[PDB]
Write a protein that binds this ligand. Structure first.
Ligand SMILES: OC[C@H]1O[C@@](CO)(O[C@H]2O[C@H](CO)[C@@H](O)[C@H](O)[C@H]2O)[C@@H](O)[C@@H]1O
Ligand SMILES: OC[C@H]1O[C@@](CO)(O[C@H]2O[C@H](CO)[C@@H](O)[C@H](O)[C@H]2O)[C@@H](O)[C@@H]1O
Lengths: 246, 246
């Protein structure tokens, strides 16, 4: 089987004061809270076993919205992310939840048009490793950047000052269970310094990373400008009576 | 002196599921929570004694944002609005807070460009009564509508099926303390059926209602479409380090 993981932690400071009290991932994006989008993408892949990671202070509001998943035809489990570490350390918390299965990890503020199903199906037919999804963007300096040559990723660089390409590595990662070994057997405070790019480069060096360029639009929702854009793009998105309630 | 009142109650159902957990007035409108806007308009009028009315379930989140007002150079008092009654019954809760002073009542989801100061100054020079602010709109059927003839309001009608005019009566009302007598000495369940328009028509019949047409833009933020519009219009609004924190 295939497990789903949504990373909804973070300070959301980029968005203060709107996120003074509210968690970024509960802010509107179209007619739905940001996080709904991630839940919908996974549901459309028949990935119903989902783990939600978020901060201690915001778990109440997240759970109030998501509940057990009954109302969305899915099933949620929650873990708390602590003050220290970021996106990479948060993934470690899912080791037991995943077990020997495979993963689709979606950073909560990554909103996009594409059904991820086709990429999940390819990954399912991939003997081992990982898969990243790329999106060509205007300001690659803000993201992880894929350096592609002759249809192969030679290197990934986090926030490069002078980008080698414009292919941003989106926050949708497909991983096998070996990712936990890398993190798990790091270590120790080196795991606090770890970034998702390092994990991706680890698969790359081992020669088991694959990639696909996404078709539709994509955007993060972590700044006022990008949050607004996400709302413009999401205006007409409709998830059906199951997500419209109630 | 002049008191400020912000009515931030309501079910927010028009906006479900975004308002499943979050109160409508804490949703983003530009780089700030909706309610901040109302607080800023009053502050710019040197109206620092403000009462916030909201539902029982959402008071925690509202207070978490607004606090005592110290951080905004204002001063808040809060009262809870019950299940029954609406916008008119909520105003009754402010009788003691206001006392013998005058009021500026702002419905929390009414976002607009104009400084209300000029209208507050005119009202201050008005011997008694009330003052409404009008805005010419595209779909008057959704609002209270002012029927103007020879520069005088002949009548106000709530949600008219066949509007006599396109001047919508915006949710910014200036009242003297006599408004509480009308409500107070209604009554009884007739007060549950009461609408703000009735109050306005009461002043009108007594021949003490005045009006002004607003200059800039205005919009409610009570539907997905109008909430989005409000966000577009509010993109560049900046309230300063006092409201940007922290
Ligand atoms: O996803 C939001 C948040 O994640 C950060 C973490 O530093 O960047 C990660 O996600 C990006 C896509 O959102 C990737 O391009 C990047 O490689 C990854 O580190 C923040 O920059 C961003 O605000
Ligand atoms: O203000 C939001 C909310 O108020 C209602 C209450 O029925 O209408 C009131 O406010 C309007 C402006 O927002 C006025 O035009 C109207 O006269 C007044 O009743 C709702 O219609 C609206 O969603």
């Amino acid at each position: 089987a295939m497990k789903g993981i949504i990373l909804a932690g973070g300070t959301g400071s980029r968005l203060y004061p709107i996120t003074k009290v509210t968690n970024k991932h509960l802010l509107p994006v179209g007619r739905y809270p940001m996080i709904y989008h991630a839940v919908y993408k996974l549901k459309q892949c028949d990935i119903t076993d989902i783990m939600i990671i978020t901060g201690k202070e915001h778990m109440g509001d997240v759970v109030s919205f998501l509940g057990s998943g009954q109302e969305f035809g899915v099933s949620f489990t929650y873990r708390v992310q602590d003050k220290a570490g970021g996106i990479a350390q948060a993934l470690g918390l899912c080791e037991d939840f995943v077990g020997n299965d495979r993963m689709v990890v979606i950073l909560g503020d990554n909103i996009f048009s594409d059904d991820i199903r086709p990429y999940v199906e390819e990954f399912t037919n991939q003997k081992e490793g990982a898969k990243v999804l790329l999106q060509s963007v205007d300001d690659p300096e803000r993201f992880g950047v894929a350096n592609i040559q002759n249809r192969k990723i030679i290197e990934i660089e986090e926030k490069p000052k002078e980008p080698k390409s414009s292919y941003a590595v989106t926050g949708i990662y497909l991983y096998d269970s070996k990712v936990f070994s890398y993190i798990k057997e790091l270590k120790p405070s080196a795991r606090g310094e770890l970034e998702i790019t390092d994990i991706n480069n680890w698969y790359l060096k081992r020669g088991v990373l694959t990639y696909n360029e996404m078709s539709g639009w994509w955007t993060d929702a972590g700044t006022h400008v990008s949050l607004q854009r996400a709302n413009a793009l999401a205006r007409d998105i409709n998830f059906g009576k199951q997500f419209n309630g109630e």
